[PDB]
Amino acid sequence: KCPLMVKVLDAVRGSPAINVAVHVFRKAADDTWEPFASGKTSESGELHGLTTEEEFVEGIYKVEIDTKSYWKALGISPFHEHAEVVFTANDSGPRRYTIAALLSPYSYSTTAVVTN
Amino acid sequence: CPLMVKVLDAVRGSPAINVAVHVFRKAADDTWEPFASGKTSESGELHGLTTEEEFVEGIYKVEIDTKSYWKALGISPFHEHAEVVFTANDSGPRRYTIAALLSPYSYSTTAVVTNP
Amino acid sequence: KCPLMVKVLDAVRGSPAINVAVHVFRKAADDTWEPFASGKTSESGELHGLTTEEEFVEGIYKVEIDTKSYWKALGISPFHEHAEVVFTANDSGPRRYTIAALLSPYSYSTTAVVTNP
Amino acid sequence: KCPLMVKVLDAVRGSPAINVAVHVFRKAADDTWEPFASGKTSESGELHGLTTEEEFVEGIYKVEIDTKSYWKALGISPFHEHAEVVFTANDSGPRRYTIAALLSPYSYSTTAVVTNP
Questions:
Q1: Looking at residue D106, what DSSP letter applies?
Q2: Breaks in chain C, named by the residue before each, with C–N above 2.5 Å?
Q3: D73: helix, coil or strand?
Q4: Least C-beta-crowded within 10 Å: which of A67, B67, C54, D15?
Q5: Considering only CA atoms, which of A15, A112, A115 is closest in space to residue A63?
Q6: Separation between Cα atoms, residue D106 and residue D111, nearest integer Å
Q7: Nearest-CA distance C107 → chain B (Å)
Q8: What gap in Å lies between CA A90 and CA A54, rounded to an integer?
Q9: Are B10 and D104 in contact (CB under 8 A)?
Q10: Which of B9, B43, B112 best tests the A interface by mutation, with the highest count of A CBs <10 A?
Q11: Are A9 and A108 in contact (CB under 8 A)?
Q12: Is B11 close to D105, i.e. CB distance below 8 A?
């Protein structure tokens, strides 16, 4: 029932990315990013309970995924400092957002699943 | 289930529903004999394709019939279908998740293998 | 001016994939694939001069990228036996086809660029 | 040719993305982004002359690909506000960097092709 959930996959090992730092920001009135939520992916590669529907108000959100630390913890030098997704949430009604990221050392793919 | 298929649509930001999936096994004469079939559910998943008893070791081909998916939406695609060919259960029983992300002129596939 | 090009990229080293075997098969009237063209990607991970425009006719073509040999040479055990792309070519006129593939050990993505001469 | 190049592709129509705004930033000493370069994609979806070797110095760069405006011009409402790539460049000597982005309305994949001249 979480409005926002983040799923991270490893394309080199073919397993969920475990213990990946995820930071969520909201755009402020002065075009600044303020901290909104944080967490780390579980052993299933997904992060639940980031925020409730009461907090998850309409705005422009930034989901920052700390891919650099994850690849460094595996002894791999990556290219991107981080993989982050900027999107507008709850523009027309509350929706449940899933941010799926597929990670490689020098490339990444991200897709969104938006439902009601 | 030891073999699961998940399909996602990168154009509409939703799971791909009612997508035909056909599983083949390479025979002794390099021939693909039918093994399992189904269609993705409302969540874009295909459950209960096989059981570990009959999911013997061998080369398996998972054909995701993408062209029929796009024609039912009014889009003329490029690929005739998306096919994933892999060796399964070579070094002991495993659980396989085939994930595909579909675009009219592109697609990406990934696999998650977990030791039970 | 070749109407069929194959470009292959590596998503792990962030470099073009070099010396990747690429086999092109054409579908016959009895639902089997018969060889049409073959070659290996160059130092820039590209494959030009596969055939000629007149020889490249309407039909269903299969491009197999032998990714498993690429990963085994690199010392990585992959998941996919190969990356095969099957498409209908020249359905409504002579087009130029570029097949681009991005490779990871357990995943890959492919795309196509189609232009009208 | 140029130390920085951007390639943008469109996976919905299978053609290069034409006239796509690309912005390049450089991180300042106070952890702020200062403008570095900008341009629009050519007929082949490429950016050239965006910078040369001596301007393109070691640092943390942000390549912002304005995908939202591209999809609106096509009558498509996208998901991401932009495609946004942060990386460190020339940390061990000058390199040629090619950013390649494949765009879909609700997804995008980006890859880098780093070469040593």
A1: S
A2: none
A3: helix
A4: C54
A5: A112
A6: 17
A7: 4
A8: 12
A9: yes
A10: B112
A11: no
A12: yes
